[PDB]
Amino acid sequence: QPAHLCFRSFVEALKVDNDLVEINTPIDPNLEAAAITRRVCETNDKAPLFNNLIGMKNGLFRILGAPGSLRKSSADRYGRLARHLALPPTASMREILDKMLSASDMPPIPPTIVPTGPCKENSLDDSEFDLTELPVPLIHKSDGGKYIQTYGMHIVQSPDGTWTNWSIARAMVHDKNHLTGLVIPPQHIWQIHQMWKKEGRSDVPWALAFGVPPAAIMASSMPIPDGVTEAGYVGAMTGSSLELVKCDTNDLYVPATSEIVLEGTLSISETGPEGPFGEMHGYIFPGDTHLGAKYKVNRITYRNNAIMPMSSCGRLTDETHTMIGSLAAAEIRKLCQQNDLPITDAFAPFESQVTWVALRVDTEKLRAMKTTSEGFRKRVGDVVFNHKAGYTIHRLVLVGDDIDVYEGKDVLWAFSTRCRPGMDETLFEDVRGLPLIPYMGHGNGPAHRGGKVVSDALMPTEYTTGRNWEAADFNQSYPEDLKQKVLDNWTKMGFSHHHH
Amino acid sequence: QPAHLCFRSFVEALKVDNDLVEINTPIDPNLEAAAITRRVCETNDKAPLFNNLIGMKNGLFRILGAPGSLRKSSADRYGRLARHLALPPTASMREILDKMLSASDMPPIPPTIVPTGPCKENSLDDSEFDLTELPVPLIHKSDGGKYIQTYGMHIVQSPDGTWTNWSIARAMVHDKNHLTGLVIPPQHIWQIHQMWKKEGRSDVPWALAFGVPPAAIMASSMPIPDGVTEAGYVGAMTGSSLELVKCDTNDLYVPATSEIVLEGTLSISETGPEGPFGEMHGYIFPGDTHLGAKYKVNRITYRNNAIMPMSSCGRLTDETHTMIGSLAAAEIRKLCQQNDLPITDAFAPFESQVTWVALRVDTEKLRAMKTTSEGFRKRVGDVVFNHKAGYTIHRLVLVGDDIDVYEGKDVLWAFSTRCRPGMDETLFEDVRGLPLIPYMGHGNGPAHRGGKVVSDALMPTEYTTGRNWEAADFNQSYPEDLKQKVLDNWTKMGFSHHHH
Numbered sequence A, B: 001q002p003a004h005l006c007f008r009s010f011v012e013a014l015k016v017d018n019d020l021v022e023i024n025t026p027i028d029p030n031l032e033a034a035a036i037t038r039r040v041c042e043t044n045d046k047a048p049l050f051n052n053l054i055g056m057k058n059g060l061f062r063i064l065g066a067p068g069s070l071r072k073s074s075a076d077r078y079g080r081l082a083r084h085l086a087l088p089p090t091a092s093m094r095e096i097l098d099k100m101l102s103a104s105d106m107p108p109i110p111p112t113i114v115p116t117g118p119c120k121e122n123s124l125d126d127s128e129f130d131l132t133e134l135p136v137p138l139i140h141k142s143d144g145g146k147y148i149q150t151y152g153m154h155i156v157q158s159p160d161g162t163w164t165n166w167s168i169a170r171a172m173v174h175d176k177n178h179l180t181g182l183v184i185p186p187q188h189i190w191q192i193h194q195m196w197k198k199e200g201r202s203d204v205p206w207a208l209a210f211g212v213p214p215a216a217i218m219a220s221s222m223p224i225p226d227g228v229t230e231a232g233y234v235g236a237m238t239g240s241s242l243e244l245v246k247c248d249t250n251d252l253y254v255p256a257t258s259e260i261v262l263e264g265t266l267s268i269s270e271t272g273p274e275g276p277f278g279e280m281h282g283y284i285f286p287g288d289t290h291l292g293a294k295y296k297v298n299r300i301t302y303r304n305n306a307i308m309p310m311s312s313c314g315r316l317t318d319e320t321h322t323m324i325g326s327l328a329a330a331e332i333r334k335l336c337q338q339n340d341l342p343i344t345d346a347f348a349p350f351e352s353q354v355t356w357v358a359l360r361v362d363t364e365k366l367r368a369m370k371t372t373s374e375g376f377r378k379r380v381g382d383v384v385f386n387h388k389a390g391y392t393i394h395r396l397v398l399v400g401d402d403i404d405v406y407e408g409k410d411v412l413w414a415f416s417t418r419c420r421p422g423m424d425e426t427l428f429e430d431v432r433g434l435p436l437i438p439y440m441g442h443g444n445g446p447a448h449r450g451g452k453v454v455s456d457a458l459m460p461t462e463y464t465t466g467r468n469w470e471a472a473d474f475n476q477s478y479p480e481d482l483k484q485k486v487l488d489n490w491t492k493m494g495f496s497h498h499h500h
């Protein structure tokens, strides 16, 4: 089966790519696996596969770290993401995000139910497993639990059966048969949870599948619209109906090739201690435990020689940056276009800790709108910050057509030189904020409200008559024939490969 | 003579350092020399020495580009700056800025007058030179003139004789015996010019010395206090009295080893077209010519085989970043300390196009002040933005003790995660602004006023009880013994030199 449709095949793809380090000597899931993975993420090294995890029993489990993190080379920087999607390993960010958006104007391709798959090779009933006895990692030294769930997919369905959501949300072991985790507004797992709570009759049927088809974990990390079943969106994007098997203990359906599946319920009434956790923005607040949602596990099924993917998240660069930021930016690009705004490209610069999105403006279209910065900033921020796709983003930077938003240095240049602090910005205090950002939940103001801004790095003539500068750079401040002569004589004169 | 005291010796030092490319074939001063130099600056290559400049006659002149730009290696990144100051080539930014500040609490060491020096080896009187016939560079394709002056020192003295200022300000050729250039508030050349204008009796005696002692061009680029003669400050910093010779046609004194000296007057009444120029923030606005100050040249003296230093300035990284930004930041650090503010370090991140300064706070001292963000931001911004040392800086970022302000990635991390937009910021609209920033002079508001901000990236507990987080990074979220084990086993496991 293809790498984008089968996690086991994805691991083989990383090996073939010379992008895997297999570690066959004993590694402790208490911090060691995650420390190695953290080092990998901070240095853009090969992904680690821990084949000999201290505490692994009866097949549960090996760990793959850094599944969606960056490669060292510029030419295949995003190759691990490309390998989630059947794209060439040299694919650009633009090409990856376009692939992720391509299903948004296609009919869904609903999944196909099959009678069995590798995820049924082994099972443990409620008398046979204990989550406290598995080699669940302690990911950061101050975490408030062992975070089993950093790269699996939660599966919950609306009470009326019409929407099945797949998403990533963290969860940690509570006791032998429970997890606690984040379930917070406006996330779809929370929206669905609320539907069950208002119905008031039963806990939410739930499954958590680890080592799912890579294309499915990508959509799990993307804020596709309310009501849209991720499986059919992935089917459309990949051109293939995903094969799913029914859970044993409930009527949810999981990918046939899932490495590990937990089946059970998400409580509509119970909570338990959750966190703290070393989060996407690079911080942990030791001791800041709060009550989180509580999951009961009734059954485990798993592949022979199951592999658990793990994100050792925090400071740059890991899945919480490459996937959360970029996929939010993609959805924001589309949202803006659907609201008739002249946005061509969007990206969350890593330098911003993926709290900014830079929006590239088609300034020919902007000029035709015969508008102003104040008005335009207001319109953009209203669209984005009132929508779920804008949840994680606290600063929008509007830039003109000369800026490549996928290049952080160029975004920082434009922001620092073209947006006058205060005057060229509009603050938004009556929008939902992301509490996980330290300046929100641990800051001076409301944890859940405000703290957002549109920063307009469009110059005045971009609204009127057109760009009225040239850059003072090699590219723009010298004629073509001279530039080429300089380049052609560069090594001859005594000065200093694409792939590397 | 030492490299820090003699420009010719500095050029030899760069050669010895394997940090020079000598180009002995003909190079056109019309764009080609500056294009090569621009490429060097954008790639951190070796400095170019153009020994065969088309139009060089009777010894005027060779060009050295990129004299204060960066080296490629991390270990000697700032080595060219270190070579201005007799520091080891591995000197840190902190060490360079401390050297530049060291004279601020020392007695001046006044200069020594000597009867002659190399700068008197050749001369051209007013019947013998024509500035339009020298190989003056066109630095950017849209510049409004040939900018002879990008790395020399203007020398002007107060009418009462008590202050002699040395500074860098650009100037271009106007005609055979005049330059035009920027002379703008609050710069010392402008302050002195104003004194002569109010006296109303004569034009300002002036000299412009190119290829001065490297320690002197550093102080020329630094906003040392009003009234302080740079020569005595350099003397103190270097521990040696600078040797100066008298001009032939006026009573100013120039460094004995200056490569090229122009003597004449800065008019108190005349102006001429100046600019546009590709400036420090990375832009040129073609056609934006404005009236500038007008200089009359009466005499040229020069060394045999004179070398003109040239900054091909614009986008990162060149002298306008390494020297303007860093030296402003140094002076701001000292200013803050002298105003009893608990600042330990300051740097202008290159990523900000040197429009920001990050201020590292001693948060033990801050806690003892029993203050708040609003109050502290206000106090810091009042000190800095009401002072000349703050002129070029539009954003101050306050960070706590865990942030290395000399590392832009860490400044950007702290700004993006710890400063809530709006709430954690104070805008300053009634301060002098830097018109050269595009969002000022070519922006939506007053060109010369406002557009400044203090952004407080101190977390709330840094004002009260102390830091209450750990970073989710390799360094902070794993114990020492584990980190060391990981590092020791890194290459053994299969993962990937200081000098490179």
Ligand SMILES: Cc1cc2c3c(c1C)C(C)(C)C[C@H]1C(C(=O)O)=C(c4ccccc4)[C@]4(C(=O)NC(=O)N=C4N2C[C@H](O)[C@H](O)[C@H](O)COP(=O)(O)O)N31
Residues within 6 Å of the ligand: A149, A150, A151, A165, A166, A167, A168, A169, A170, A171, A182, A184, A186, A187, A188, A189, A220, A221, A222, A223, A224, A277, A278, A279, A280, A281, A311, A313, A319, A320, A323, A324, A392, A434, A436
């Ligand atoms: C990739 C990824 C992702 C994620 C995550 C992760 C990862 C790796 C981890 C590691 C686990 C971390 C964590 C966190 C931390 O940082 O901790 C986080 C946060 C983030 C932001 C926000 C808030 C939170 C999470 C949780 O927990 N919760 C939630 O909520 N979310 C989330 N995410 C996101 C998501 O996935 C999206 O958003 C979609 O979109 C969903 O879907 P829908 O369907 O709903 O749309 N997480």
Ligand SMILES: Cc1cc2c3c(c1C)C(C)(C)C[C@H]1C(C(=O)O)=C(c4ccccc4)[C@]4(C(=O)NC(=O)N=C4N2C[C@H](O)[C@H](O)[C@H](O)COP(=O)(O)O)N31
Residues within 6 Å of the ligand: B149, B150, B151, B165, B166, B167, B168, B169, B170, B171, B182, B184, B186, B187, B188, B189, B220, B221, B222, B223, B224, B277, B278, B279, B280, B281, B311, B313, B319, B320, B323, B324, B392, B434, B436
């Ligand atoms: C290093 C350097 C420096 C500079 C420069 C340069 C360089 C290389 C060039 C290339 C030539 C460029 C130019 C520009 C452009 O960019 O164009 C500029 C600007 C900048 C900012 C601001 C405004 C302007 C100059 C002019 O022009 N003007 C002035 O004013 N200034 C200046 N600078 C600064 C200075 O030097 C300081 O500031 C001190 O400090 C002085 O001294 P005192 O004594 O007064 O204190 N420049």
Ligand SMILES: [K+]
Residues within 6 Å of the ligand: A166, A167, A168, A219, A220, A221, A222, A223, A224, A230
């Ligand atoms: K999703």
Ligand SMILES: [K+]
Residues within 6 Å of the ligand: A373, A418, A419, A420, A424, A456, A457, A458, A459, A460, B439
């Ligand atoms: K603007």
Ligand SMILES: [K+]
Residues within 6 Å of the ligand: B166, B167, B168, B219, B220, B221, B222, B223, B224, B230
């Ligand atoms: K100066």
Ligand SMILES: [K+]
Residues within 6 Å of the ligand: A439, B373, B418, B419, B420, B424, B456, B457, B458, B459, B460
């Ligand atoms: K703050």
Ligand SMILES: [Mn+2]
Residues within 6 Å of the ligand: A165, A166, A167, A188, A223, A224, A225, A228, A230
């Ligand atoms: Mn969803």
Ligand SMILES: [Mn+2]
Residues within 6 Å of the ligand: B165, B166, B167, B188, B223, B224, B225, B228, B230
């Ligand atoms: Mn001065």
